[PDB]
Design a protein around this nucleic acid. Sequence first.
RNA 1: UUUACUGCAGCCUGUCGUUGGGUUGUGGUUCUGGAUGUACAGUGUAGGUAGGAGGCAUCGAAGCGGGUGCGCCAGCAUUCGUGGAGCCGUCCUUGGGACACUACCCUUCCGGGACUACGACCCUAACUCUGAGAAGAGGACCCCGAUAGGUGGGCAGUUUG
RNA 2: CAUCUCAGUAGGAGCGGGAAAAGAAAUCAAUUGAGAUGCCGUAAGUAACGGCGAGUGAAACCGGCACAGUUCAAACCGAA
Lengths: 196, 115
Amino acid sequence: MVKSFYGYVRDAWKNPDETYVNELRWERLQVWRKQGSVTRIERPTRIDRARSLGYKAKQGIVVVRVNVRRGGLGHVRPNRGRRTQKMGKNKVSGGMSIQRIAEVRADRRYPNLEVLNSYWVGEDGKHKWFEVILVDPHHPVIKSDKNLNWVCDPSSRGRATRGKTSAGRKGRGMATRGKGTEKTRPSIRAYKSRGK
Amino acid sequence: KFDVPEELTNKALEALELARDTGKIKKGTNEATKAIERGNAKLVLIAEDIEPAEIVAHIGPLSEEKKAPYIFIKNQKELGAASGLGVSCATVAIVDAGKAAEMVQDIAQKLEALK
RNA sequence: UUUACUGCAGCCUGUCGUUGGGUUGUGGUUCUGGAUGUACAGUGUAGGUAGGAGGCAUCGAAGCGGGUGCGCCAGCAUUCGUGGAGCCGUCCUUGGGACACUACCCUUCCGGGACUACGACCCUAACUCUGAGAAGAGGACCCCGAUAGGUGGGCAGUUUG
RNA sequence: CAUCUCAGUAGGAGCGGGAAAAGAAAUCAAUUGAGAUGCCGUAAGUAACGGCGAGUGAAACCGGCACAGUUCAAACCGAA
């Protein structure tokens, strides 16, 4: 075989708790816990994951690590009249996934960029960590790049907030075609949010 | 593994210079991995200051699988310089030794001993 | 309002994750030294059910010490020794099983070595509190996420013909 | 009246353009076929759900409008 080192990074991260990544995870969550919500990083933790998701080593491509709490939609008990069905909220998790929460927090932190994609990079009993790739549509490098210059279009702005990333489409139910996508494509709002 | 001697690492760097002069060097982690897998790697130099460590974590076990001598360099700036490159380099593989074949085999034997 | 109905918060508690390293106590995981197997007597221990008979031996076959496997201080393997012939059975010791040194997986044997679920204790290194910090105190507990049961007019919606 | 309905409605928060979203099958079919997406008609108050009560409620096929296909990650090269 002649495999790339991206393949080895993939194998190492296939079962991370059974590889050296578990120990690295042990030292590394110590540093990550001390960090805040949204941290810029020089290089992706999983280079092969970043490159397959669209990361390139060029000007205007930023990579960030976002920390998100665990569990479901931390929800308030209603204080007025409700049905019994609508009174309970503890078991009500949201419809917004943790990955998309992290993507949207990164987008909020970086107003001038657009979220491309994100990937899981760690988690503990309280937090999950994601790495979000962002693109600068106003950088000349990105403008020249013909595989990324679609992001300079007026419709590519607000991708993470409008659900246009891969995680957003998965949460919208458009990851598949055919049966089960009757109330999801072309949009959740198009069918009165009855899908999902 | 005991710490490889400083003069031995400097001999490795000199061999890298001479392989630049005459032989063949694959600079970059993907190229070095391809060379080790193909079995063309006479010598492998791996930087120690790599972040994240996943980039060159596999190089050691791969070279010990394929019987390729490998050494660790203190950091990647002078490894890239020894590979004649304006950037850093996490690992290089001398695949053609030029007139540094004798010194490369000397480093290989010394690494085998120190292992 | 409540020991009306049905729920929901809060709280109590089991389990999973967070969550690591040691010491022992508990189950078999897995296998070395023996196939250790024996109503009746045995020349002889069914040498597992077996080509219902057929191989070894002074270059090894025994009557002995607390008998190294075992056991009815018998007897098979020749070992620390010294004593100077155990055959297979078509005389089957009128058969719970009747027996050739022939790749022993099998009720034993206790190196149980190695992973495992529960429980007890210890360590710090994660994690928590204090401090500007050195550090101090706790510590894989607690908090927290999820799940399971309870308690629950604290709160919600109703009913009370 | 509690599941249900009202209804993902009202209302809220975020993003955002002249349109937006979707978009080139890990699809739909059924014995063998079709061939991106969207929208309209139909399927049809059918299948399905439901104190199987009240009610809620598709899609495919098919007929049309308009039609459009492609770019990365990797393999090979190695700053070209």
